Amino acid sequence: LSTMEKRRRDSEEEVLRKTAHRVDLIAKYIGGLREQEKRIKCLES
Amino acid sequence: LSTMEKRRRDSEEEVLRKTAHRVDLIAKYIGGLREQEKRIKCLESQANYCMLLLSSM
């Protein structure tokens, strides 16, 4: 069972699915996260 | 052997997996940066609040 499941994990199609999901997660949050980098520098001063 | 090596390296599946790992690191760091930015925003707001009363002398 362990081996079959490790094979299911390392499956290429699921790898692509996971990667695409992560990139979309980037697009949602990091898509908005890359903002106000200079705000901390402007206010801290 | 160098030829077989170069072939093993540029193998498409290896490309995909190296890409996956790089994306893993980048996305984890993006989440961490989001959390740290939230915490820093809270800290700067509180410091700007308190310094007004703790002004000087």
Method: cryo-EM
Q: What is the resolution of this structure in A?
A: 4.3
Q: Which amino acid is at B42?
A: C
Residue of B36, B27, B19 whose CA lies nearest to A30 = B27
Any B CB within 8 A of A43 CB: yes
Q: What is the DSSP string of B6-49?
A: HHHHS-HHHHHHHHHHHHHHHHHHHHHHHHHHHHHHHHHHHHHH
Cα–Cα distance measured from residue A16 to residue B15, given in angstroms and rounded to the nearest whole number: 12
User: Which positions ≥6 away from B48 have C-beta within 8 Å?
Assistant: A43
Cα–Cα distance measured from residue B31 to residue B36, given in angstroms and rounded to the nearest whole number: 9
Tokens of B13: 């599946």
> Could you count the other beta carbons within 10 Å of the beta carbon of residue A19?
19
Cβ-based neighbours of A44, under 8 Å, separated by 6 or more? B44
Chain B residue with the nearest C-alpha to that of A32:
B34
Residue among A16, A19, A26 minimizing CB distance to B30: A26
Nearest CA in chain A to B39: A40
CB atoms within 10 A of CB A4: 8
